[PDB]
Amino acid sequence: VSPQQDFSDLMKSWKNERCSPELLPYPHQLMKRLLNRISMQSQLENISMGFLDMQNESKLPLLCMETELERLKFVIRSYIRCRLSKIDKFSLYLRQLNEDENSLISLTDLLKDEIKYHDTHSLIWLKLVNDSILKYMPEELQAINDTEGSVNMIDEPDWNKFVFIHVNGPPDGENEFGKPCYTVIPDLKEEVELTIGSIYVMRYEVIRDLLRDDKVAL
Amino acid sequence: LFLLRHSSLYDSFYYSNYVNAKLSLWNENGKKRLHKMFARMGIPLSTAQETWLYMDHSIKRELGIIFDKNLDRYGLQDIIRDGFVRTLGYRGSISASEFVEALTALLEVGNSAQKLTNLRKRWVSNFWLSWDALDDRKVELLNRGIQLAQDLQRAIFNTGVAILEKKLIKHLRIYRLCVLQDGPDLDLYRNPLTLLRLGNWLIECCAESEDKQLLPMVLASIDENTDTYLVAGLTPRYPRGTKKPILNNFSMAFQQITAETDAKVRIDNFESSIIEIRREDLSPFLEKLTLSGLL
Amino acid sequence: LPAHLQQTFSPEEIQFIVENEPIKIFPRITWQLITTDDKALNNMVAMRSTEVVLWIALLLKQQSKCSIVAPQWLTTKELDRKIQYEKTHPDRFSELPWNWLVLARILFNKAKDDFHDPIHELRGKIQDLREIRQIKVLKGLKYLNESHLQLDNLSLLEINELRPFITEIMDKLREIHTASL
Amino acid sequence: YYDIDDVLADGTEFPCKFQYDIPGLGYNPGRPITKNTKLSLPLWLARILAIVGPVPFVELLPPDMFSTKVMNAIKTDPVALDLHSINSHFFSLAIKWIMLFSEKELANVVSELLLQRAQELNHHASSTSTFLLKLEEMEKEIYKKSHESYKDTKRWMFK
Amino acid sequence: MYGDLGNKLVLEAKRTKQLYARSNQDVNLPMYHEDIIRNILKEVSNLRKNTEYLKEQQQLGMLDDKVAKCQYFVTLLCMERNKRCLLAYQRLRTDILDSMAWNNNGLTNNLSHQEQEYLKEYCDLITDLKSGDLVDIDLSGSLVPPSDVFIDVRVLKDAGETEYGVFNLIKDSQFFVRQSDVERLIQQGYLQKI
Amino acid sequence: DNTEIIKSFKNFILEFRLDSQFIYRDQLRNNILVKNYSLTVNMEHLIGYNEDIYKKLSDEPSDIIPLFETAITQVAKRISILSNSLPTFQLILNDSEHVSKIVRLSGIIISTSVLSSRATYLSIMCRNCRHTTSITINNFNNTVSLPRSCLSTINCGPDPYIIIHESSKFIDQQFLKLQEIPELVPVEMPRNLTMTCDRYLTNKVIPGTRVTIVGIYSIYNSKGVAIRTPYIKILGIQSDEEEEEEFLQLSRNPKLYEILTNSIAPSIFGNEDIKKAIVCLLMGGSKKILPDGMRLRGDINVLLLGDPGTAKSQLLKFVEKVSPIAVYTSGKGSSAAGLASVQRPMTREFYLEGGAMVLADGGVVCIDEFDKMRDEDRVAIHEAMEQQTISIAKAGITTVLNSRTSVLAAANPIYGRYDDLKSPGDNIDFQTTILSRFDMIFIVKDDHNEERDISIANHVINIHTGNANAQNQQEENGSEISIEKMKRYITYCRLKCAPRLSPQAAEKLSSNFVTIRKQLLINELES
Amino acid sequence: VKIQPPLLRPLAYRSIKSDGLSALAEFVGTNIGAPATIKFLEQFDQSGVKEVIQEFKVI
Ligand SMILES: Nc1ncnc2c1ncn2[C@@H]1O[C@H](COP(=O)(O)OP(=O)(O)OP(O)(O)=S)[C@@H](O)[C@H]1O
């Protein structure tokens, strides 16, 4: 809840966001409180407007404050626009994932602006593909989804792809078995394993649990 | 001497304004006299044509002693000066004078009434290229202007010889008067500064002095826009022999003649010395200039 | 949709990341930014060491209100022992501050005046050690196969630019291999 | 799929003869063509043509591009071999063919070839002559990305 | 020779990528070839008309032979192929416009009307999201991180001219100003040096 | 001493630093990974570096070449570790007063030689005691030779050393020969010299270019009056991505056809159909490599038969100046220009020298005086433009060679303008099959138009005097900035595009050839 | 048409209710200057402000 750590986690989650190939839980519990706090300080400009009134000095933190405001605002702009982009590419499969019962639905936890842009964009998109090519819509071809073969609208839940990762985790003072460091896992091959000081690139799937656990940096 | 570091000592004198009238470079008589100066210097003609960078070290170190031992014959004894030289290290030193000439050259090249104003707009457009040119690190653009300065000085001295053959000067007692009504490469003459230095190049040439009574020169040119004929004032240059507070004359005379009927006259030029006038009306303007002469 | 990189971070973006680094300074003065994380502090005594984030120091240096202390780790003799350790370690990429590249680029822009003769001295050293590090990356890079990649110690900048290559290749290897089953 | 390479990959014609009689030649006015007629056919159609039966509809004759002369030739000196004339889509194509046929040996072969190609392609990447022209599509795209990465990096050093 | 029109169009798309590569991004898509699309439609229409014809005749003279089902299975794939080409084509065709909708908004005529319809609804939709944040975003621009804080910009054919104060835009006059107002004027191309 | 110079240049590459950037170490770090095995140094930057170094290079070049080769290879070994077989590099830089000195110059290439080879590193052997040493060499232009002692003592004497050929190393050698410039001082016969090339400079320029060569004017002795032939060793030959950006910009403007017809002959007013056909000649059509046993032809042909005074001569000269490779010939009778060469003589060997169509394979051939020409080797020209296949079945050789040329004609009918007042044929006395084997036939007429006459008058006076047409600089600011620009553009244009016609346009030509053949039926059968 | 209302608001500010200022910002929003928007806005009871801000054939 500390602004220092909030900002730390802000840049943290931004990096995590941009590195991750596919969607992550929406942090409204945090995103909201920050969007409000920034609007508070943002309005808080008032001392600058009241400063012209004293005329019938040190503006350094003033513009520094303003600077960091817009600066952090940049960070969040990239963050949100990036999420939007990812959704645009994953839109068919994410809605199909919404159709399925298990595990976690799209909704708001994992995903408000997003869902609106998602459904609306997909809507007009369907109007754009529909009015153009599907008119001219053969009976079997009427469906826009996996037939199967080959395939479509199933892409791209690939967790197997390699990506850079960095071992970092909360210290006991658990899974640290020694001698140097933690932890122990491919399906067809064994553990390598890991050390907190060096990045080991491997399959994004095996480390997914750790990203949910926040046990490995990206 | 001009364009010292980036050009041949030969071309340096060849295009030298100071050396010009004293040696009468336009005429053939002083040509051999110039080679005679090199014969005193013991320098091969081919050695003079090489770039300053590749000339031998001996020729470098001995240059000033040779100058001291030769140039005095032609009365050039007062030349050597202790002027400052910048050290930017690795790309080589340049005297402030040369960089000045190159930057001003960059100002003049390297770029009904709507066309003239459009061209005026283009002159202001060339200013920012110069303001940008003031930095040390941006050398790429600077070398272009450095070389174009040579292209100008070439055209200056060329047209100069052309003027020397026809002798269009009216050696009057009141003031000398001239006009260039036609000639090749008149586009370069649009800039007042072209004619400023051009006039200066003439003023020292026609009168060294060359006693007596230094006199002002008149100059003008026009191509289109209905006889614009920019006429800029010009003043004599003494060869070190401000002896008197003379300064200028023309501002009062321009006020007297512009106070008359002043038909088609345009004082649009920011500098008081230059004015646009119709040739039809320039002739009486001259008549009124001769008399009543304010000087 | 910026599209760039999109996988890599832009160099200027990683510069934006390194902005977060705290550093010691020597202010000319002898505040209470409400924004986010500084929270500190009372007016500092002149020529006294105080830790502050990088970009604010850049500001104060632009107004020349602070005297930046040079980082103690950056000393030519230390880079000499690093290069020594490098000639004897064909595999290990040992010590790097990890952000040092961009630092040195920035410190030589302005902070250059405080250091004692860095000119034509450490600049060569950092370059020399840089390139020998790059090639040692290449020597370990020829060994590349799934599933392990030795990431050991490197400055984040070079890791970022080399990212598209290895990242896009290894996927092909894994795919063809596992797929063959 | 939506990747340009997919339709591009399935576009190449493969000479695989069918096991049965085929009325309605899609390529002539027989009308039915007798069984075992070898004809080049696009990977997309021919890929699953024999998948349906349980006897397959197509013999799936071995590719000429995958000839032992080709495969050992590539096993010899990868740096000089020119993939651009023969296919030119090779890794992205061979993976599809090898999925259909499911052989483990040549996969293990081609992978090393790709590794050395990578080595070499990254060596030209730092900043030719004629080799730079023969590279397959995927490696070309990666080369563009790598080039801008380093150009911009050194440019990022100064201005 | 058969799915050939698809090859030409997919190829044109492929070239259009490289046409857009550096480029500078001046990308003005040449045209929508609907004539070739018509040819696709004529071939599919003929194909499925014969297909439905044999599908009806299957109860009388074909007698549902096993080999007869193959041609249906063939044309179905071919249909998907055609579809696939147009889908991907349009998806990229759409994508590039979408990019052009983002970058310069900001803050043609030759292309097919359906695109402009989608475009106008897309831009209206993105303005709806701009209305939602109220953050502020300003999400379509401000791509480069700021520093530090002031910059010197020169006018690009703008005179002109206002936000917070009227600065009296004057042609060919360079200033020294903070990034803020510059960000708005650069969207109109009115400023040149950065 | 010896190593101090090596230390000075290692202290040059490693310890030079201009404002925020070091340049030469980056040059070498780029070149090794590229597999260059070479290095380029701007001598003007070297003069910019120090003063004593340059005069030292100025005094003895033959002695200071190896310190560069050593400084090249010692830095190259650190990056070589960073990169087995690695030789020493070669640096490439760019009369009584000229013996063996650093002089740059310029000329034209007369004739090259065949890639030859000297040796670089070599080991010898004593054939009796089995004593082996090894010597590496660089300056192959006399100084040292093989000794005549077993050297184990330091009697097998005299020279027992046998060159081990299985464990030697070699480089390549070129040996050009250069010819003086045809514009200045031939007030004579052309003179020539002898060149000699080193490692990476080999096989670089096909002869005909106008080039500059930096060199060393040294002296050798081979074939009591001290007659020695002099020569110039070649160091740094220089020849004749962003441009692609402006190329694509120039490709799509719909006014390109006209702006190119504002680029060919600014000195010549009128004759716009000719002025247009030159545009199409400098580009070259398609090239078909069919299953058919032959391939077809791409370049085109230009004729200018007509009345004298037209200055079609000036036009054909400027055609030669625009294309990168082309042969201009003025008539059948020269002072010195030939056309399959037959050379019979030293060593009593027959060898093939050259000619003219051989230089212009894939270029432009200009033939003036089409009717002033003999029938002595005309047959080679009657075939070179149609099947591209020159056969030789003489005493020396029996080959079939290639000739990808394009011929440009400029004739004169008999009696000038009266040839069109009689029957419209009556021009070539032999037959019309040569013209049928050409492409374009133009007839230049001469009709009085007083306004056209005054315009052609004052247009040409303005060309001579007062540089009125010569305004071109603002035109450069607005159209066709250079001729050399047009040349670089044609080089880029020929090998990149792969043109072919379009299927919807083919039926138009099929319906048009019918109309032309019908046109000939109308003028022929009724007449 | 593209505009930024946060930039627009302090200009409009030179008390005024948010509803009136926002309403006029929205309505005047279609009209745009280069900008000239300042010239039209300066030209402008609540009723008077509201009215002031507002400012089948044959071929
Ligand atoms: N516009 C022009 N028209 C014609 N001649 C010109 C023109 N400008 C300059 N000339 C000169 O006038 C000469 C006229 O002769 P040409 O035009 O060469 O006649 P010709 O028809 O070539 O006779 P040839 O060379 O034996 S076919 C040229 O060679 C030039 O020297």
Author numbering:
A (entry chain F): 54 to 97, 99 to 110, 121 to 175, 177 to 238, 248 to 258, 260 to 293
B (entry chain G): 326 to 436, 462 to 591, 597 to 650
C (entry chain D): 3 to 32, 50 to 200
D (entry chain E): 3 to 29, 33 to 58, 68 to 141, 162 to 193
E (entry chain C): 1 to 107, 120 to 173, 176 to 208
F (entry chain 5): 23 to 105, 130 to 140, 152 to 198, 203 to 215, 235 to 267, 269 to 304, 320 to 336, 351 to 449, ...
G (entry chain B): 10 to 23, 32 to 51, 57 to 66, 80 to 90, 170 to 173
Give passages from the manuscript.
Hetero-tetrameric Pol epsilon plays a key role in replisome maturation and origin activation. Pol2 is the catalytic subunit, with the N-terminal half containing DNA synthesis/exonuclease functions. The C-terminal half of Pol2 (C-Pol2) has been predicted to contain a second polymerase fold, which has become inactivated during evolution, and is followed by a zinc-finger appendix.
Here, the double helix enters the MCM pore through the N-terminal tier, and single-stranded DNA (the leading-strand template) is captured by a set of ATPase pore loops (Mcm6-2-5-3). In fact, inspection of the CMG contacts reveals that N-terminal Dpb2 engages C-terminal Psf1, in agreement with biochemical studies on Pol epsilon replisome incorporation by the Labib group. A second contact point involves the C-terminal winged helix (WH) appendix of Mcm5, which is clamped between the inactive polymerase and zinc-finger modules of Pol2.
